[PDB]
Amino acid sequence: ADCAKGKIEFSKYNEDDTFTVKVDGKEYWTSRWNLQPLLQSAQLTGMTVTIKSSTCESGSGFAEVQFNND
Amino acid sequence: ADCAKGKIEFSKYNEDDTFTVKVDGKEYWTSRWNLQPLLQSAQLTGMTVTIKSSTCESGSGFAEVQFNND
Amino acid sequence: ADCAKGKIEFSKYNEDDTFTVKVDGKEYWTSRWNLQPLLQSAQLTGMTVTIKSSTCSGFAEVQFNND
Amino acid sequence: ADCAKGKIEFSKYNEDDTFTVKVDGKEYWTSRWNLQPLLQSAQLTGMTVTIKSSTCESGSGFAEVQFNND
Amino acid sequence: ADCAKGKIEFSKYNEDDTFTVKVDGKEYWTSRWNLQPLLQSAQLTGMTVTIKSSTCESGSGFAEVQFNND
Amino acid sequence: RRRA
Amino acid sequence: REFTIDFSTQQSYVSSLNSIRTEISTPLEHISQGTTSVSVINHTPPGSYFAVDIRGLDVYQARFDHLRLIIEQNNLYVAGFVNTATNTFYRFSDFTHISVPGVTTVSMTTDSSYTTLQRVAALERSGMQISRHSLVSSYLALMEFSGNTMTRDASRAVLRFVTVTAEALRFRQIQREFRQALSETAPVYTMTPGDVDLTLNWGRISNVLPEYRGEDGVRVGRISFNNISAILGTVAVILNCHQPECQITGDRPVIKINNTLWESNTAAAFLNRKSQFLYTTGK
């Protein structure tokens, strides 16, 4: 499902080497290594992302994300 | 074939770890790991990218792309 | 625990391939290679970083916030 | 030997895992993945690059390049 | 020891996959691939870098470098 | 791209 | 609004451009010396245009005087050209929303993009030569032109005239370099890669310069300015970014880094790399 669309409010590198972003007031983690710099750059430029996941509650995991030009 | 030439309208990191870009109304995916930051950089700076592939229908894969400043 | 909050005042690549950052007057290092670009980007763009850890030495958890 | 000095006119990743840049009207390629982000950043920021090679003929490979802000 | 402090005057990818920077008139090279984009970012943004090494003669190697903003 |  | 651009002398040409700028734009508070500024195009409703009458191709002579350019005001795009002798407006396909009263409008199949123009013209802008003589040739080619589809010679004419009118309006650098060709020496102006890059980065520059507050430098993609004289010597007129050309992605126009104003997307585009060893070995 498209769980959250908007700017990254913060990001966090985690001790288990996953990577968290907060989007639309909810936190999502990914273990996809390659997303880490891509998400941080989106964050620094205020680029809208769409987190896609099976569950959308804060604390859910994702392996899919769309980088939009909004 | 020169499938599409234009700005990256969106990019998406896919579940299978491939990377999709939308160029000139059509979606193309690549499994080439080297291309993921390159493509995002092109999207961030509005580069004109040329997707080259043996099929040009939306949902085709590609492993060849040109990054133009014009 | 939040070991430190603030701007990165300097960063350093170390000979043992760890990475040091200095935030709010305190130095911390990480062995996580992927934190090296993440931290340098934060330093360049003026992000506030929150170094987190059990023992506030090394770290592998850090929050990034735009300024 | 200095093969070409200038800003990168375009870059392109080819299906055969080579990475072409065009500098001062001449094209060269490298298969060093290390050089793909370095070159693309040099392209998008307008760095002056100097392609160096013992043999500077057209279409030849390289793995030495200098980067200058101006 | 602090071999050199200042802005990167040029950087250069070398055919042995090492990477050279010129800082305060002195050239140093590193075989740490992780430093290549970091040094380029430093170059691009005019950071003050401090080359640290046990041998500070020009053309020597290094694997320790500090990054400072203004 | 860029229009004239 | 009707304006003349008079190519008779460097004085008449620069005066013409300056008058247009004064009428259609307002100086940036922080990038302005005397009456020489970076100016923001004043807002007009979409579809608003002004007319430019081409004069002075033959120095101070009332001849070659039937060419008018139709310029969309908000973005300085040439929407097409008017043959005032035939009263015909040849309008590019991407300007069907530009209505000019009193003329016969010929809607063309050709769009105004530089990509299309350069293809039809068989002429790349980088290295393109413009002289008084080739502007007379361009004038003649556009006056001979009829039909709904741009020819090669009419496209070459549009490339040259757009460079010396709209692009010079935007960029003091192009005004300064091209005007040499109007002197009695009659040398040739050669468009440089740098000139081309300036035109290609006009929207991005427009989004960044309103944020400038005396920083030691400005970096916008491939474009670098190192002081206010570099800015003023290069740029004259920018879009009103407060147009779709102002934004690529994201919502942060600038990042100040080490006393330089960066386009935020440029910095983001070289700070999105993962660890180099991991990148290169993860094939």
Longest dimension (CA), chain D: 32
Chain E partners within 8 Å of C29 (Cβ): none
Rounded to the nearest 10°, the torsion over CA C45, G248, G220, D5 is 110
Q: Rounded distance, CA G218 to CA G169, Å?
A: 21
- Number of helices (H), then strands (E), in chain G: 11, 15
Q: Rounded distance, CA G26 to CA D24, Å?
A: 38
Alpha-carbon torsion G210, G211, G215, G219, what sign?
negative
Shared domain for G134 and G6, answered yes or no, is yes
Tokens 């922080």 belong to which residue?
G30
Of the candidates C44, G248, C42, the residue with the CA atom closest to the CA atom of residue A36: C42
Q: Rounded distance, CA G186 to CA G181, Å?
A: 5
Which residues on neighbouring strands pair with residue G105, listed in sequence order?
A: G89
Best of G204, G262, G263, G274 to substitute, by most chain A Cβ atoms within 10 angstroms, is G274
G79 and G92 in contact (C-beta within 8 Å)?
A: yes
- Cβ separation G258–E69 shorter than 8 A: yes
Shared domain for G125 and G176, answered yes or no, is no
Q: Rounded distance, CA G194 to CA G230, Å?
A: 14
Tokens 């120095």 belong to which residue?
G59
Beta-sheet pairing, G88-91 with G78-83: antiparallel
Q: Rounded distance, CA G37 to CA G157, Å?
A: 29
Q: In what order do the strands lie in the sheet with G254-257?
A: G223-225, G217-220, G260-263, G254-257
Task: Count CB pairs under 8 A between chains C and G.
Answer: 23
**Interface check B24 vs F, CB under 8 A:** no
G2, G29, G72, G167: the active-site residue = G167
Taking the CA of residue E33 and the nearest CA in chain G, the distance in Å comes to 6
Q: Rounded distance, CA E38 to CA C14, Å?
A: 13
What SS3 class is residue G111?
Answer: coil
Nearest to B44 among A45, A63, A64 (CB): A45
**Interface check D70 vs G, CB under 8 A:** yes
**Interface check G77 vs F, CB under 8 A:** yes
Tokens 């209505």 belong to which residue?
G99
How many beta carbons lie within 10 A of that of residue G109, not counting itself?
Answer: 10
Q: Rounded distance, CA G153 to CA G140, Å?
A: 10
- Cβ separation A66–B15 shorter than 8 A: no
Q: Rounded distance, CA G154 to CA G61, Å?
A: 23
Q: Rounded distance, CA C45 to CA E20, Å?
A: 25
Radius of gyration for chain E, computed over Cα atoms and rounded to the nearest angstrom: 11
B44 and B32 in contact (C-beta within 8 Å)?
A: no
Burial tier of E2 (Cβ tally within 10 Å: 0-12, 13-18, 19+): exposed
Taking the CA of residue B4 and the nearest CA in chain A, the distance in Å comes to 19
The total domain count for chain G is 2
Tokens of E14: 């070398």
Q: Rounded distance, CA G59 to CA G256, Å?
A: 48
Q: Rounded distance, CA G99 to CA G45, Å?
A: 13
**Interface check B70 vs F, CB under 8 A:** yes
Tokens 């290594």 belong to which residue?
A33
Q: Rounded distance, CA D8 to CA D49, Å?
A: 7
E contact set with D (CB within 8 A)? 10-15, 17, 33, 36-37, 40, 43-44
G40 and G239 in contact (C-beta within 8 Å)?
A: yes
Q: Rounded distance, CA E39 to CA E34, Å?
A: 9
Q: Rounded distance, CA G263 to CA G106, Å?
A: 40
Tokens 């950087």 belong to which residue?
E11
Beta-sheet pairing, A64-67 with A49-52: antiparallel
Beta-sheet strands, E only, within chain B:
2-13, 19-23, 26-30, 48-52, 60-61, 64-68
Of the candidates E50, G198, C48, E9, the residue with the CA atom closest to the CA atom of residue D68: E9
Of the candidates G282, D32, D11, the residue with the CA atom closest to the CA atom of residue B33: G282
* G261: containing domain: 171-283
φ, ψ (nearest 5 deg) of residue G257: -130, 120
Taking the CA of residue A65 and the nearest CA in chain B, the distance in Å comes to 5
Tokens 């032109």 belong to which residue?
G145
Q: Rounded distance, CA D14 to CA E4, Å?
A: 40
Q: In chain F, what is the straight-line distance between the N-terminal and C-terminal CA atoms, in Å? A: 10
Judge whether G215 counts as a catalytic residue.
Answer: no
Chain G partners within 8 Å of F3 (Cβ): 75, 77, 94, 111-114
DSSP H/E element including D40? helix D35-45
A23 and A4 in contact (C-beta within 8 Å)?
A: yes
Alpha-helical segments (H) within chain G: 10-24, 114-121, 132-144, 152-162, 168-170, 172-179, 193-200, 202-208, 228-234, 264-270, 276-281
Q: Rounded distance, CA G155 to CA G158, Å?
A: 5
Angle (nearest 5°) at CA G223 between E8 and D44: 70
- Number of helices (H), then strands (E), in chain F: 0, 0
Residue G226 neighbours by CB under 8 Å, 6+ apart: G216, G217
Deposited experimental method: X-ray
Taking the CA of residue A49 and the nearest CA in chain B, the distance in Å comes to 9
Tokens 């043999």 belong to which residue?
D55
